[PDB]
Amino acid sequence: MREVRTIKVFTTVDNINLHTQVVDMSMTYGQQFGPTYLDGADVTKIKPHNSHEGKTFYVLPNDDTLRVEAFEYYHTTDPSFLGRYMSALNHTKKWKYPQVNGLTSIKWADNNSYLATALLTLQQIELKFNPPALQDAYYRARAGEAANFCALILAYCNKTVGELGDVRETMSYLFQHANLDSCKRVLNVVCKTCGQQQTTLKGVEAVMYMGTLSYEQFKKGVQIPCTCGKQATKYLVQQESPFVMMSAPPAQYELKHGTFTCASEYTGNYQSGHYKHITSKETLYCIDGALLTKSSEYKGPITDVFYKENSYTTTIKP
Ligand SMILES: Cc1cccc(NC(=S)NCCN(C)C)c1
Ligand SMILES: Cc1cccc(NC(=S)NCCN(C)C)c1
Ligand SMILES: [Cl-]
Ligand SMILES: [Zn+2]
């Protein structure tokens, strides 16, 4: 064969901006591009095919044009992000995403129940992501194709497919990448020996609390240790957010219809467990991936409860 036989392909980091390439079919993609992927699959050690003509390949950002695009799209500089995203995508593109009670869920696979619950929660709270990658993928998940959204969640949370996940920790990562700058929380803490003390929390900190599942109990007061050695009380002074997340180590808890938005239930230990999702609508639905049951009341090992909010100020006279 005289001269090199070639094909035209496009490389990308964000799957929107394309970069024309002529590739030599006698060499692998890795020899010509560095690590290369085709819709999640690692083709780095593969030589081009005629069927590859015109297709888009993900590559790592090795030149300043790809770097600017990658960061603008993903808001990250982690050198392994894009590989980790493609590894996850190769699995999540195979998962199933059924509509359960009007929401996009995920049929159980690969220990993914924490992702199912996280995805179902997102569709019930008001949240705008900042990274365009997350906006595009979330919009597409809402409509049914969550494969890219779930791979991105995995990649942002630095969990690989199959690894144990926490819903609260995942929610925390996603909240970091969301506009919550309009959120504010004022707390006060009362100690018999030490006195009063107010604290103001902003952004993410201000919509997550660890220690009680009850927003009522949070408004009324909760007991905590003080530097002196005694128990002090912490109560909510003011709240400004479209939702609040209350979390605590899993514990038997009664979910009362119409008193909360949705919740996470965790059964197991630190080694091994399973998440179910409970949403309060016309009744209480339990969504367990593809599975759906209902009940008028619920008692279970609850670990996260989501409530909604706009503005709240305490009637407690300090
Ligand atoms: C995608 C992107 C955009 C802008 C800057 C950087 N960061 C770089 S290229 N910094 C040093 C190399 N380390 C990553 C190992 C990465
Ligand atoms: C250290 C700590 C403190 C408070 C809450 C949790 N979260 C838990 S125990 N969640 C259960 C699901 N994970 C085990 C995968 C962990
Ligand atoms: Cl968004
Ligand atoms: Zn004290």
Q: What is the DSSP string of 68-102?
A: HHHHHHH----TTHHHHHHHHHHHHTTS---EETT
Please give the distance, rounded to the nearest whole angstrom, from the Cα atom of residue 15 to the centre of ligand 2. Answer: 36
Using alpha carbons only, what angle is made at residue 225 by residues 220 and 228, rounded to the nearest 5 degrees? 125
Cβ atoms 193, 213 nearer than 8 A:
no
User: Does residue 95 contact residue 276 with C-beta atoms inside 8 Å?
Assistant: no
In whole angstroms, what is the distance from residue 318 CA to residue 314 CA? 10
- Interrupted after residues, the chain (C–N over 2.5 Å): none
**Among protein residues, the one whose CA lies closest to atom 7 of ligand 1:** 77
Helix, strand, or coil (residue 45): coil
Torsion angles phi and psi, residue 169, rounded to 5 = -65, -40
Q: Do domains 6-60 and 87-176 have the same CATH topology?
A: no
Q: Which alpha helices (DSSP H) does the chain contain, by range?
A: 29-33, 64-74, 81-92, 113-122, 132-142, 147-157, 167-176, 215-220
Q: Domain-by-domain residue ranges, the chain?
A: 6-60, 87-176
The CA–CA distances, whole Å, from 234 to 183, 190, 192, 316 equal 19, 7, 13, 12
Between CA 276 and CA 49 the distance in angstroms is 44
For residue 59, how far is its CA from the centre of ligand 3 (angstroms)?
25
Q: How far is the CA of 242 from the centre of ligand 4 (A)?
A: 33
- The CATH number for 6-60, chosen from 3.40.710.10, 1.10.3720.10, 3.10.20.540, 3.10.440.10, is 3.10.20.540
Tell me which of 1.10.8.1190, 2.60.220.30, 2.60.120.10, 3.40.50.720 is the CATH number of domain 87-176. 1.10.8.1190
Q: How was this model experimentally determined?
A: X-ray
Q: What is the resolution of this structure in A?
A: 2.6
For 154, residues 6+ apart whose C-beta sits below 8 A from its C-beta are 84, 85, 88, 92, 115, 160, 161
With the most atoms of ligand 1 within 8 angstroms of its CB, the residue from 59, 67, 74, 76 to mutate is 67
Residue 165 to residue 222: CA distance in whole angstroms? 28
List the residue whose alpha carbon is closest to atom 8 of ligand 1. 77
| Closest residue to atom 14 of ligand 2, CA basis | 270
DSSP 8-state code for residue 15: S
In angstroms, the Cα distances linking 130 to 64, 136, 178 are 22, 10, 5
> 192 C-alpha to center of ligand 4: Å?
7
Contacts of 127 (CB under 8 A, 6+ apart): 174, 175, 178, 180, 242, 243
Q: Are strands 243-255 and 298-308 parallel, antiparallel or unpaired?
A: antiparallel
**Does the C-beta of 64 come closer than 6 Å to ligand 1?**
no
